[PDB]
Design a protein around this ligand. Structure first.
Ligand SMILES: O=C(Nc1cccc(Nc2ccc3c(c2)NC(=O)/C3=C\c2ccc[nH]2)c1)Nc1cccc(C(F)(F)F)c1
Ligand SMILES: [Cl-]
Length: 263
């Protein structure tokens, strides 16, 4: 089996509520004596089993644009995972607070980083199923990473199981078919989110109507600050049939290249 990294409970010093805590952590950083971390704690039947599995996953599911997972903490009571600290909080919130401020080059840099994480995710055959800006974190210097924080203040983005329908393609709405291609669909919407400063897709629309409009083949309109090429990438994510969608490697290549070439 996968050996998850264990962190001594005594090496964590809680500081502040961020169900997640900002903490100092000792005996971790090669250099600095202590380093800031984010700490998540919970205790049920398929909580404890899910927790261990997730830790094993996150032990190797690691990449520059995935939230760094440091390991698990203590011996069980409570169950604690240790993640990197990203000072700027979740991207959704950050977008919204940097809205009518973020320029084109920055938005591309955000979008391209997320695509980069998704390229890694696809290479690992990992289907995320809940990709959206609310599930990204922002670090120093617009550093952006993908995590998976579950489905409270984004409760409206889910539909009574809980479904992030506004970020889902038709085949996921209908058959609950989730693949890299449905992740690609979501990415298209993240793209829309980014260029609208974290507005909710189909805000005017009830959940039922969203389900209707997605099934109908209707797509989000282009934001004012979105260059047509970027919207085109949006469309390639929103092809009705999944095998016709751009794959994440192409999307990243396009977004990366635009970002590099933009003042
Ligand atoms: O992300 C996951 N778990 C999880 C659950 C709860 C919390 C966290 N990590 C987290 C959450 C919030 C913050 C953080 C780490 N570091 C911070 O700095 C955070 C918030 C903040 C607010 C203001 C400043 N910082 C991970 N699991 C997971 C499972 C499968 C795949 C993935 C992947 F690939 F990363 F998407 C992922
Ligand atoms: Cl403590």
């Amino acid at each position: 089996g996968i050996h998850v990294q264990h962190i001594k409970r005594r090496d964590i010093v809680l500081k502040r509520e961020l169900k997640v805590f900002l903490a100092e952590c000792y005996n971790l950083s090669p250099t600095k004596d202590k380093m800031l971390v984010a700490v998540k704690a919970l205790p049920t039947l398929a909580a404890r089993k899910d927790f261990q599995r997730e830790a094993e996953l996150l032990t190797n599911l690691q990449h520059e644009h995935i939230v760094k997972f440091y390991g698990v903490c203590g011996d069980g009571d409570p169950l604690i995972m240790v993640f990197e600290y990203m000072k700027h909080g979740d991207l959704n919130k950050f977008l919204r607070a940097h809205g009518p401020e973020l320029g084109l080059s920055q938005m591309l840099h955000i979008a391209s980083q997320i695509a980069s994480g998704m390229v890694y995710l696809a290479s690992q055959h990992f289907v995320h199923r809940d990709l959206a800006t609310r599930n990204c974190l922002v670090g120093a210097n617009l550093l952006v990473k993908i995590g998976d924080f579950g489905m409270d203040v984004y409760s409206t983005d889910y539909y009574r199981t809980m479904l992030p329908i506004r970020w889902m393609p038709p085949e996921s709405i209908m058959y609950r078919k989730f693949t890299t291609e449905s992740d690609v669909w979501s990415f298209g919407v993240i793209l829309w989110e980014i260029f609208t400063y974290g507005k909710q897709p189909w805000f005017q629309l009830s959940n039922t109507e969203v389900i209707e409009c997605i099934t109908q083949g209707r797509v989000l309109e282009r934001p004012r600050v979105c260059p047509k090429e970027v919207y085109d990438v949006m469309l390639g994510c929103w092809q009705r049939e999944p095998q016709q969608r751009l794959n994440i490697k192409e999307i990243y290549k396009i977004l990366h290249a635009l970002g590099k070439a933009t003042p």
